[PDB]
Design a protein around this ligand. Structure first.
Ligand SMILES: *[C@@H]1O[C@H](CO)[C@@H](O[C@@H]2O[C@H](CO)[C@@H](O[C@@H]3O[C@H](CO[C@H]4O[C@H](CO)[C@@H](O)[C@H](O)[C@@H]4O)[C@@H](O)[C@H](O[C@H]4O[C@H](CO)[C@@H](O)[C@H](O)[C@@H]4O)[C@@H]3O)[C@H](O)[C@H]2NC(C)=O)[C@H](O)[C@H]1NC(C)=O
Length: 312
């Protein structure tokens, strides 16, 4: 390395991702204080040789050879110019391209080697689902699927699935292919209910035709108030005076776990009744009415259905 960093400025994604058979599109801009370029060489994994004071390694593009040939056919194309643009294109990209790309540039009196890492996986890597840390029932959440890839030669699509079924909601797909970031994003608005807790949400990466490429899956953690099931003995809730009545309050689902329970009779809170079992001994005709239980967790309180107790 015999370069003066004050003579060069570069703006590019410092790491780009792709997979075998796809393509990579590398946005890149630069400014050379020493003037226009006189030569550009694209190395793959360059190594500086102290003997000849030169860089050894595989040359993927040479301005003196490839820059004189019709390049529309070529796999490796330099789409830049002499003063401001260093954009690269590799179509198709191969696993052997994985490593660091060496942008060897020379002005009239200055030389520089700008390095960009290219991570190519053998298989298409999965996207990444991003969820809010807190999801509760009846809340509208934006499901975000992020893929750190985008290239013009290889269009793709992100498909949202809920329990293996494509989601009916429309998704908004956005792409960025700039010197700052390269990604494909999909956003889907979605209002989960309590029944979506524990279900599987899938974001599939597909090609332009719809062939499966990869997928990321998340198991939804959906907070919800306790869903209650109330039972009464006797079953018909019809008694006569003096008999005993037992009502129980079962939590069929709660996220997070319940913390308290109370009982109500015709809208009136039953004091000293803070367990999941209500026992009425020697019932009078005044104890007739509509009974229900209420159970609360961190989300909020829930209520069971009403039992119409009748004292004949
Ligand atoms: C450095 O300089 C180079 C060349 O001057 C610039 O490269 C151009 O970049 C633009 C995008 O920034 C490219 O436009 C895209 O073309 C894609 C298809 O390319 C066809 O056309 C080119 C010729 O223009 C052919 O060579 C090629 O074989 C194809 O036939 C489209 O798919 C793209 O459309 C997508 O993006 C647009 C928004 O940009 C959306 O509206 C579309 O819906 C779609 O999503 C896009 O139009 C252009 O092709 C590139 N030129 C060349 C010759 O390759 C670099 O941008 C520049 N670097 C910087 C950092 O500015």
């Amino acid at each position: 390395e015999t370069g003066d960093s004050s003579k060069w400025v570069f703006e590019h994604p410092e790491t780009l991702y792709a997979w075998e058979g796809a393509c990579v599109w590398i946005p890149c801009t630069y400014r050379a204080l020493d003037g226009d370029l006189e030569s550009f060489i694209l190395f793959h994994n360059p190594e500086y040789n102290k003997a000849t004071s030169k860089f050894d390694g595989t040359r993927l593009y040479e301005s003196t050879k490839d820059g004189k040939v019709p390049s529309e056919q070529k796999r490796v194309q330099f789409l830049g110019d002499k003063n401001k643009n260093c954009t690269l294109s590799i179509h198709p990209v191969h696993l052997a391209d994985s490593g660091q790309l060496g942008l060897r540039m020379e002005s009239k009196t200055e030389k520089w080697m700008e390095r960009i890492h290219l991570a190519v996986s053998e298989r298409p890597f999965p996207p990444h689902i991003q969820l809010p840390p807190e999801i509760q029932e009846s809340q509208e959440v934006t499901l975000t699927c992020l893929l750190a890839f985008s290239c013009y030669g290889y269009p793709i699509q992100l498909q949202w699935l809920l329990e293996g079924v494509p989601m009916r909601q429309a998704a908004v797909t956005s792409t960025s292919l700039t010197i700052k970031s390269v990604f494909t994003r999909s956003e889907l608005k979605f209002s989960p209910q309590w029944s979506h807790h524990g279900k599987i949400v899938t974001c599939q990466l597909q090609d332009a035709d719809g062939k499966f490429l990869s997928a990321d899956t998340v198991q939804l953690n959906v907070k919800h108030t306790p869903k209650l099931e109330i039972k009464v003995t006797p079953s018909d809730a019809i008694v006569r005076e003096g008999d005993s009545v037992t009502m129980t309050c079962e939590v069929s689902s709660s996220n997070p776990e319940y913390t308290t329970v109370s009982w109500l009779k015709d809208g009136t809170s039953l004091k000293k009744q803070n367990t999941f079992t209500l026992n009425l001994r020697e019932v009078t005709k005044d104890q007739s009415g509509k009974y229900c239980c209420q159970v609360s967790n961190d989300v909020g309180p829930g209520r069971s259905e009403e039992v119409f107790l009748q004292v004949q």
